Amino acid sequence: PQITLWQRPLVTIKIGGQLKEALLDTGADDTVLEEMSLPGRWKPKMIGGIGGFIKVRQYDQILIEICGHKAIGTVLVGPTPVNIIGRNLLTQIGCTLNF
Amino acid sequence: PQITLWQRPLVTIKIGGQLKEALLDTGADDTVLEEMSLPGRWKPKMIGGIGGFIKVRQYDQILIEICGHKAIGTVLVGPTPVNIIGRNLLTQIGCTLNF
Numbered sequence: 025p026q027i028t029l030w031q032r033p034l035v036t037i038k039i040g041g042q043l044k045e046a047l048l049d050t051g052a053d054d055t056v057l058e059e060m061s062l063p064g065r066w067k068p069k070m071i072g073g074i075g076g077f078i079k080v081r082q083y084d085q086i087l088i089e090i091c092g093h094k095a096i097g098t099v100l101v102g103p104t105p106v107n108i109i110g111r112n113l114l115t116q117i118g119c120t121l122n123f
Numbered sequence: 124p125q126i127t128l129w130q131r132p133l134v135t136i137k138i139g140g141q142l143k144e145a146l147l148d149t150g151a152d153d154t155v156l157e158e159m160s161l162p163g164r165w166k167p168k169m170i171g172g173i174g175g176f177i178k179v180r181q182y183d184q185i186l187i188e189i190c191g192h193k194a195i196g197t198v199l200v201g202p203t204p205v206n207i208i209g210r211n212l213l214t215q216i217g218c219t220l221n222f
C-alpha cells in the first residue's frame with residue numbers, strides 16, 4: 025500500500041500472538057515495543073532519541089507480522105511511549121520512502 | 124526519488140543558505156534542527172521523544188530546501204541529536220511510505 029503522512033503512519037502488527045498498534049518510523053534504527061514478555065534470552069541495551077536514553081531489553085530473531093507481511097529481526101522492549109517499527113524491520117517488508 | 128532503508132535516510136537540506144544533513148523521519152510529527160540562528164520571533168514548544176521531553180524554539184514560515192524540493196513551514200530548533208525532517212514538511216514534498 026501507499027501510506028500518506030498527513031497523520032502518523034500507524035499500523036497493526038502481530039507479535040507473540042498479540043495484536044498491537046505500531047508506528048512505521050524511518051527515523052528509528054531499530055524496533056522498540058512497550059514492556060511485554062518475549063521468549064528467549066535478552067541482552068540489556070541503551071538507546072537514545074529525543075529527550076535522552078532509555079534502557080531496553082534486546083531480543084533477537086523475533087517474528088513479527090506487519091500489515092500481513094512476515095518479518096524477522098531484533099526487537100527491543102522497554103519504556104517507549106509508543107510502539108515503533110524501525111528500519112531493521114521496515115527493510116524486510118520492502119518499505120521505501122518516495123517523493 | 125525512491126529511498127530504501129538499509130541505511131539511515133539522510134538527505135541534504137538547504138536552510139539559511141547553508142547545506143546540512145538531515146534525517147527523513149516518518150516518526151517525527153515536526154521538523155527539528157540542531158542549534159542555529161533563524162530570522163524572526165520564536166514561540167516555545169515542548170516535544171516528547173523516546174527519552175523524554177526537550178524544549179525547542181518554534182519558527183514559522185521558514186524556507187527550507189529538501190533534496191531540491193522547496194518547502195516553507197514551521198521549523199523547531201533545539202538540542203536534538205540530529206537534524207530531523209518531520210511529517211509537517213514530508214507532506215509538503217509529497218513524501219509517502221510504500222511497500
Ligand SMILES: O=C(NCc1ccccc1)[C@H](OCc1ccccc1)[C@H](O)[C@@H](O)[C@@H](OCc1ccccc1)C(=O)N[C@H]1c2ccccc2C[C@H]1O
Pocket residue numbers: 047049050051052053054055056071072073074105106108110146148149150151152153154155170171172173204205207209
Ligand atoms: O528517536 C529516534 N531514533 C532513535 C531510536 C534508536 C533505536 C531504536 C528506536 C529509536 C528518532 O528520532 C531521530 C533520531 C535519530 C538518531 C538519533 C537520535 C534521534 C525517532 O523517529 C523519533 O523522531 C520519534 O520516536 C518515535 C515516537 C513517536 C511519538 C512519540 C514518542 C516517540 C520521535 O521522537 N517523535 C517525536 C518528535 C520528533 C521531532 C519533533 C516532534 C516530535 C513529536 C514526536 O512525533
